[PDB]
From a paper:
pmcSteroidogenic factor-1 ([name]; [name]) is 1 of 48 human members of the nuclear receptor (NR) family, composed of ligand-regulated transcription factors that control the expression of genes involved in critical biological processes such as development, metabolism, and reproduction. [name] is critical for development of the adrenal glands, gonads, and ventromedial nucleus of the hypothalamus (VMH), where it also plays critical roles in steroidogenesis and energy homeostasis. The endogenous ligands for the NR5As are believed to be phospholipids (PLs).
However, a small molecule (“6N-[name]”) that simultaneously contacts deep pocket and mouth residues demonstrated low nanomolar affinity and potency for [name]. To visualize the 6N-[name] binding mode and understand its mechanism of action, we solved the structure of the [name] [name] bound to 6N-[name] and a fragment of the coactivator transcriptional intermediate factor 2 ([name]) to a resolution of 2.59 Å. There is electron density indicating the presence of both 6N-[name] and a PL in the pocket of both monomers in the asymmetric unit, indicating partial occupancy of both ligands in the crystal. Modeling of both ligands is supported by the strong electron density centered on the sulfamide group of 6N-[name] and phosphate moiety of the PL. We modeled in dipalmitoylphosphoethanolamine (DPPE; 16:0/16:0), which has been co-crystallized with [name] before, to satisfy the PL density. The sulfamide moiety directly interacts with the side chains of T352, M268, and backbone of V326. It also engages a water-mediated hydrogen bond network with H310, R313, and L324. The strong density for DPPE interferes with proper refinement of the carboxylic acid tail position, pulling it away from the residues that coordinate this moiety in [name]-1.
Author numbering:
A (entry chain A): 221 to 247, 257 to 459
B (entry chain C): 741 to 752
Write the structure that this text describes.
Amino acid sequence: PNVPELILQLLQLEPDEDQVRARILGSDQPAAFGLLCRMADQTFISIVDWARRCMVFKELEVADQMTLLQNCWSELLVFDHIYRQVQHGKEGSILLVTGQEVELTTVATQAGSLLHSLVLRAQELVLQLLALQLDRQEFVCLKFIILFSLDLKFLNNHILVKDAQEKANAALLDYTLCHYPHSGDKFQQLLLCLVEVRALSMQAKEYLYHKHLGNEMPRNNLLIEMLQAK
Amino acid sequence: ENALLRYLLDKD
Ligand SMILES: CCCCCCCCCCCCCCCC(=O)OC[C@H](COP(=O)(O)OCCN)OC(=O)CCCCCCCCCCCCCCC
């Protein structure tokens, strides 16, 4: 009944859709590829500032922060999109952070095979999460889990990163056991959906690489700069 | 290193 304190603080740090819908803005017919690209780039910037405000992450050195964010940027973008579909919008349409809704018909007719496949599998994951009744507390907790999903070996500060991982998983478990009276083990099935999200985000990386080899993306697209970090 | 990440972590 009592939600863990970790989740309470993460909720307090979650910027409600209002404000970065606002700021992303101001910054039928064929789909505007380039402005959708810049929209994804602004989404990534808002996610990086969210991370900057987070617990534990705020105490690490910039190198460890860079390592962590380099390991999960695509995953966090995809998860933000999926939770945007869960929380709002219809299953005949996809909602984008600007508030625009794109119907799956438009995707099927305009998109290539791989983007189409990716949107479809994202909708599959959305349905999965709806069936397990994913809620905002779980969303922020899973975001925090993804952020620290990197193995300790690649980081200088093992102690704090591992404390964060442990406490995040404990918070999720405690919350699911106390608020989810149904059967299934929501903890484990949420974690396996995170597995699926990471796979989908790898596919998204492949899509962006395909666009880059064809020189179809804007010149200074930030997702392409992250893709090439090595 | 990733200059873009250093940028968005350092400010703006
Ligand atoms: C995994 C879930 C989200 C998808 C992941 C996308 C990865 C990032 C792509 C960033 C650029 C956005 C433009 C998309 C393509 C386009 O601008 O529209 C172009 C496609 C054209 O088709 P094509 O590009 O295949 O070219 C084929 C030419 N032969 O027309 C459409 O159908 C537009 C329908 C809009 C689709 C919106 C869904 C995109 C999700 C964005 C939200 C944030 C998710 C980002 C996670 C990394």
